[PDB]
Amino acid sequence: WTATSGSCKGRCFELQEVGPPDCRCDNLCKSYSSCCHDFDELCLKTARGWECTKDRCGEVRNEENACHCSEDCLSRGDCCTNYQVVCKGESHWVDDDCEEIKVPECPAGFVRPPLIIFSVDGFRASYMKKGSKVMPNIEKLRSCGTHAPYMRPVYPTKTFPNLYTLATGLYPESHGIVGNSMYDPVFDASFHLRGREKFNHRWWGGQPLWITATKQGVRAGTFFWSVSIPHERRILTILQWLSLPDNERPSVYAFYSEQPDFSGHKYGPFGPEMTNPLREIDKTVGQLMDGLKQLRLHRCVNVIFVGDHGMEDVTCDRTEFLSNYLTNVDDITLVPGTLGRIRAKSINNSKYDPKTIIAALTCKKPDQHFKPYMKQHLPKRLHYANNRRIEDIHLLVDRRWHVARKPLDVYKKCFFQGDHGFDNKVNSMQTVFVGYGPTFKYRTKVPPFENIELYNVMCDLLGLKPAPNNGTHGSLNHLLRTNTFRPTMPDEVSRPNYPGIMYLQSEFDLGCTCDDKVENKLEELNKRLHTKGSTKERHLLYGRPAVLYRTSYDILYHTDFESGYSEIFLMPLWTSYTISKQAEVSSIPEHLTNCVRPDVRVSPGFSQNCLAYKNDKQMSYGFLFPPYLSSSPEAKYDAFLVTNMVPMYPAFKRVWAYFQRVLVKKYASERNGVNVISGPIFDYNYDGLRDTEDEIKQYVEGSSIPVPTHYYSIITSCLDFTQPADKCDGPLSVSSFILPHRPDNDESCNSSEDESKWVEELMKMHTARVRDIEHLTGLDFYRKTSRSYSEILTLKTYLHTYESEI
Ligand SMILES: *[C@@H]1O[C@H](CO)[C@@H](O[C@@H]2O[C@H](CO)[C@@H](O[C@@H]3O[C@H](CO[C@H]4O[C@H](CO)[C@@H](O)[C@H](O[C@H]5O[C@H](CO)[C@@H](O)[C@H](O)[C@@H]5O[C@H]5O[C@H](CO)[C@@H](O)[C@H](O)[C@@H]5O)[C@@H]4O)[C@@H](O)[C@H](O)[C@@H]3O)[C@H](O)[C@H]2NC(C)=O)[C@H](O)[C@H]1NC(C)=O
Ligand SMILES: O=C(NCc1cnn[nH]1)[C@H]1C[C@@H]2CN(C(=O)OCc3cc(Cl)cc(Cl)c3)C[C@@H]2C1
Ligand SMILES: [Ca+2]
Numbered sequence: 001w002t003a004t005s006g007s008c009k010g011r012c013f014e015l016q017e018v019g020p021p022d023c024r025c026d027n028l029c030k031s032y033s034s035c036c037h038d039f040d041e042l043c044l045k046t047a048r049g050w051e052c053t054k055d056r057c058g059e060v061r062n063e064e065n066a067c068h069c070s071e072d073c074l075s076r077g078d079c080c081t082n083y084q085v086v087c088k089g090e091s092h093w094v095d096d097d098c099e100e101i102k103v104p105e106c107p108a109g110f111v112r113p114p115l116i117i118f119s120v121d122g123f124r125a126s127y128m129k130k131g132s133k134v135m136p137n138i139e140k141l142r143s144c145g146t147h148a149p150y151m152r153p154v155y156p157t158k159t160f161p162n163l164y165t166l167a168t169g170l171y172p173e174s175h176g177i178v179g180n181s182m183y184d185p186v187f188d189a190s191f192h193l194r195g196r197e198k199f200n201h202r203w204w205g206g207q208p209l210w211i212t213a214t215k216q217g218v219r220a221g222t223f224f225w226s227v228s229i230p231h232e233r234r235i236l237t238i239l240q241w242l243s244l245p246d247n248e249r250p251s252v253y254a255f256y257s258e259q260p261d262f263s264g265h266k267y268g269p270f271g272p273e274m275t276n277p278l279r280e281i282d283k284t285v286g287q288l289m290d291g292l293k294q295l296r297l298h299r300c301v302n303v304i305f306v307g308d309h310g311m312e313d314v315t316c317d318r319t320e321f322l323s324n325y326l327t328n329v330d331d332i333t334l335v336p337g338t339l340g341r342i343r344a345k346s347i348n349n350s351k352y353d354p355k356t357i358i359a360a361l362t363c364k365k366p367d368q369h370f371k372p373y374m375k376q377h378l379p380k381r382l383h384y385a386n387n388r389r390i391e392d393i394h395l396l397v398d399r400r401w402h403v404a405r406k407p408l409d410v411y412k413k414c415f416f417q418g419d420h421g422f423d424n425k426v427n428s429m430q431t432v433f434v435g436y437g438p439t440f441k442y443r444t445k446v447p448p449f450e451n452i453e454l455y456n457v458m459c460d461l462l463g464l465k466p467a468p469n470n471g472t473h474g475s476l477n478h479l480l481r482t483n484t485f486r487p488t489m490p491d492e493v494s495r496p497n498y499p500g501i502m503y504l505q506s507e508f509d510l511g512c513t514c515d516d517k518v519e520n521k522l523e524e525l526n527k528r529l530h531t532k533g534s535t536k537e538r539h540l541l542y543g544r545p546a547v548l549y550r551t552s553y554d555i556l557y558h559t560d561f562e563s564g565y566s567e568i569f570l571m572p573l574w575t576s577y578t579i580s581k582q583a584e585v586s587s588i589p590e591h592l593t594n595c596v597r598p599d600v601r602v603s604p605g606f607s608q609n610c611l612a613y614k615n616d617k618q619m620s621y622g623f624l625f626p627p628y629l630s631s632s633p634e635a636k637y638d639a640f641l642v643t644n645m646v647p648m649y650p651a652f653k654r655v656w657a658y659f660q661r662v663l664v665k666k667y668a669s670e671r672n673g674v675n676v677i678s679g680p681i682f683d684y685n686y687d688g689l690r691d692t693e694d695e696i697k698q699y700v701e702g703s704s705i706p707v708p709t710h711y712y713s714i715i716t717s718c719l720d721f722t723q724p725a726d727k728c729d730g731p732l733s734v735s736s737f738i739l740p741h742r743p744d745n746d747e748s749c750n751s752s753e754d755e756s757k758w759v760e761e762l763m764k765m766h767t768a769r770v771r772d773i774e775h776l777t778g779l780d781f782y783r784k785t786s787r788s789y790s791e792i793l794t795l796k797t798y799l800h801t802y803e804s805e806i
């Protein structure tokens with residue numbers, strides 16, 4: 001109940017929220033059914049439309065009009081946006097040539113340049129080029145301001161998860177809005193696009209920009225607009241708020257368009273009916289920019305034009321049904337669509353086995369247009385596991401397809417031609433970014449980035465200190481004319497040991513054999529130097545990674561590679577090596593097939609042993625630096641040191657071996673040498689963060705040798721490929737992966753064929769940013785380069801997607 005007897009007289013779109021049983025006059029009141037009796041009458045005028053005509057010029061102020069063309073409208077702060085154009089012979093904003101905004105041109109009383117977020121739903125990245133002829137206002141913003149060719153959304157590529165990520169800089173797994181539709185098992189409740197449940201505070205974690213702003217003394221316009229407030233009223237309300245007295249006026253604003261998403265669903269991303277929604281958006285943009293020109297704020301305000309996700313061709317006939325795979329289909333709940341989330345229909349039923357579900361959904365049809373995963377095996381780049389609202393069973397659906405439970409769910413629950421929600425690296429899902437204003441750069445294109453990075457920038461644009469988030473602060477400094485923020489490298493927490501030769505062969509009882517006794521002052525002082533680091537500036541090109549946590553570890557030097565060896569985890573945390581274009585692949589000779597040699601620099605007690613692998617019938621081992629790439633038959637003995645050894649499922653060895661024997665060499669040819677850093681990752685609790693020693697869930701049987709959940713590699717070269725990797729003068733190029741360490745190759749339906757048919761494809765799927773690896777290892781890479789730290793931060797956030805041209 002709400003005693004909605006009070007009035008909105010002069011209170012139209014008030015900024016503070018008055019609580020029950022009183023009536024509200026803020027743009028949220030319609031959603032809570034708590035508006036004052038007269039809200040519509042007074043606060044939602046429509047009469048005479050939204051534009052000034054030649055006959056309205058210098059009229060008599062009639063307060064019933066939606067907007068005004070009277071002489072005092074400028075002062076009242078409520079002219080129609082084209083007022084000055086029709087009446088005072090002024091031109092539209094779009095018609096003026098853009099002049100660089102070298103400094104903020106702000107009216108007296110304005111303490112800082114305001115920020116307006118213009119968000120557009122379902123604005124596919126390629127609309128900027130393909131609709132450019134019908135979007136002149138947006139095209140002016142783009143070309144005069146700062147733009148990316150596209151901006152990467154978060155997964156799932158849906159509205160709620162993406163808007164709240166924009167507002168908070170957090171992955172959905174962290175902010176809690178993991179879908180437009182969710183079931184929380186603790187609440188025993190469901191969150192939907194419709195309904196009032198979504199209005200409970202308990203769903204929304206993190207700290208959104210408008211709370212960040214309020215808590216630091218900066219006032220915000222609302223970020224929630226009612227469906228029945230037309231877009232023209234939204235612009236005018238923003239312009240009214242900009243006319244408020246200094247101490248009442250917000251510094252940050254939001255506008256939201258349901259278009260072009262709404263039509264995209266009906267007509268597909270490029271349906272002929274899509275031209276008009278794009279015209280409308282532009283018109284709205286024009287109105288804002290004209291309005292700001294009137295209030296003399298158009299060279300003062302920073303405007304961000306941004307979308308939440310793109311749009312793909314999807315139709316009903318492209319539906320895979322679970323009923324065609326499962327017999328017991330009625331014992332599951334499925335969150336359907338462009339992604340799939342499965343859980344049991346009841347918990348009172350413990351006969352429910354996710355293992356049988358995954359098995360029944362795996363490579364069962366040659367054409368399968370989805371792939372099942374346990375959430376912990378989803379590509380780490382999606383960061384879509386660490387929340388109780390994410391069901392253990394996930395289906396990644398092919399672009400252009402849907403998953404549903406039964407046929408009845410699709411005809412009784414074709415009316416659509418577009419959808420979104422797919423894997424966030426899919427081209428059709430990419431959306432837009434443009435920044436325009438004093439604080440942004442002039443006529444500047446920047447490389448694509450992820451939307452998790454904007455919260456930091458919007459905090460900078462507003463002199464705010466960002467709440468802790470998943471952006472990398474400084475990675476988008478190259479967008480801005482002037483920077484609030486100077487990023488600095490984290491300090492190293494653990495310094496390495498540099499052990500010498502300290503142990504004799506006979507002190508080791510590892511159960512490891514090797515045929516290596518086939519034995520000159522020249523070539524004996526020479527290999528001492530190798531063990532001292534005479535070739536370190538060859539294999540360690542960007543300085544040692546910094547260990548950002550307290551631990552105990554050794555640096556080990558060799559002819560062909562350098563490693564940071566953990567005495568705790570009994571394996572390297574990282575292994576670094578360079579393969580030049582010239583370098584050659586050789587094989588593991590017949591007498592050295594099972595060679596494992598004790599490392600005389602590390603004690604028996606801090607070594608692995610061959611015995612454990614012999615007892616463990618599920619677990620084999622591999623090497624971080626690959627024998628195949630030794631520079632000499634003499635150097636190859638180094639690769640077999642117990643300290644280069646890591647536990648590997650025979651199934652995983654297949655992936656690893658092909659990477660090491662074929663792909664590294666291929667990459668070195670194409671990129672003119674590559675530097676490779678590889679290592680283990682332990683993330684048993686799938687929070688995307690490194691696990692501590694006392695969080696290890698899997699050991700090699702009867703040992704203290706922990707079993708990695710993943711194996712990473714970072715592959716760096718010169719961006720200018722005419723220069724060798726080891727003599728690069730300028731910017732770097734990088735690609736990385738985090739491969740799940742799994743006992744089977746069930747993920748790859750073609751894995752029974754030659755590795756050259758499926759391995760590279762699996763690696764591509766599990767592509768990664770260096771930054772993701774940093775979170776997972778507690779390491780910090782690229783500490784010693786000739787490049788600026790801001791540029792290195794951009795490099796660290798880069799993701800190689802392997803998608804074709806946008
Ligand atoms: C991306 O960036 C974020 C933010 O920096 C990182 O997440 C942070 O990581 C650490 C380590 O896991 C967590 O620290 C723990 O914090 C709790 C106390 O936490 C409470 O207070 C904080 C601060 O005000 C608040 O943010 C927390 O909110 C969580 O819980 C709410 C329910 O009570 C929920 O509504 C909200 O969405 C959020 O849940 C998420 O995080 C929790 C972990 O706390 C997780 O279980 C859940 O599934 C959600 O993902 C909370 O009230 C201490 O008691 C512990 O000792 C410990 O220090 C931070 O809480 C966490 N912050 C946030 C906002 O999630 C991510 O690790 C990073 N990801 C990557 C990949 O780098
Ligand atoms: O259900 C919806 N759309 C569904 C649809 C319609 N047509 N197609 N799909 C709407 C999206 C919501 C947010 N809001 C608002 O105005 O958003 C501004 C904002 C900006 C940022 Cl950057 C961050 C945040 Cl959190 C909010 C009105 C809401 C209801
Ligand atoms: Ca972890």
Ligand SMILES: [Cl-]
Pocket residue numbers: 156158178179180181335
């Ligand atoms: Cl969803």
Ligand SMILES: [Cl-]
Pocket residue numbers: 651654744745751
């Ligand atoms: Cl296999």
Ligand SMILES: [Zn+2]
Pocket residue numbers: 121122158159160261308309
């Ligand atoms: Zn959307």
Ligand SMILES: [Zn+2]
Pocket residue numbers: 122159261262265420
């Ligand atoms: Zn949509």
